[PDB]
Design a binder for this molecule. Sequence first.
Ligand SMILES: NC(=O)c1cccc(C(=O)N2C[C@@H](C(=O)O)c3ccccc32)c1
Length: 171
Amino acid sequence: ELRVGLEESELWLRFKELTNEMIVTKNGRRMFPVLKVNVSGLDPNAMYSFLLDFVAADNHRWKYVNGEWVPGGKPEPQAPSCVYIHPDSPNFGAHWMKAPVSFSKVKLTNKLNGGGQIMLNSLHKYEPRIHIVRVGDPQRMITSHCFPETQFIAVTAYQNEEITALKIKYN
Ligand SMILES: NC(=O)c1cccc(C(=O)N2C[C@@H](C(=O)O)c3ccccc32)c1
């Protein structure tokens, strides 16, 4: 049976208990921690593509007030649909299952300046989601997998000094 498990969940939960933050910039910024998953239950003989997108978590934005994340007003219009294709795609199920699948090269940005980056709105909370797509499937079956341990708020600069120190400590 298809099983997708989050790698280094303990490290993600350290950031989440502080409310995790990810920097977005004009040219795009890579994530820390990096989203990595282990996969089992795929057909090793079949070929698949791994896709990544980011889902909004609330219908409001956030603000850091008195060292505390609080609801910070009505949200901006939803960011456009941005899908990141894992550069190993398409590949055999045996490839995806022999070692954890890392999305280390994806970049988060606040501009639609191309480059295959992910457009996010600052001060909004997002949750990464992974999609698995089989090549050649007339039913075009797709599997979606959410990871609530990896939720974060997009920021142009770190608000929580504990988050700033955490990023330096483990990266
Ligand atoms: N009748 C059908 O359900 C059917 C028939 C042929 C191919 C698929 C397919 O694309 N799968 C199966 C499954 C697999 O390959 O592990 C899978 C995992 C992720 C994404 C797609 C798919 C589904």
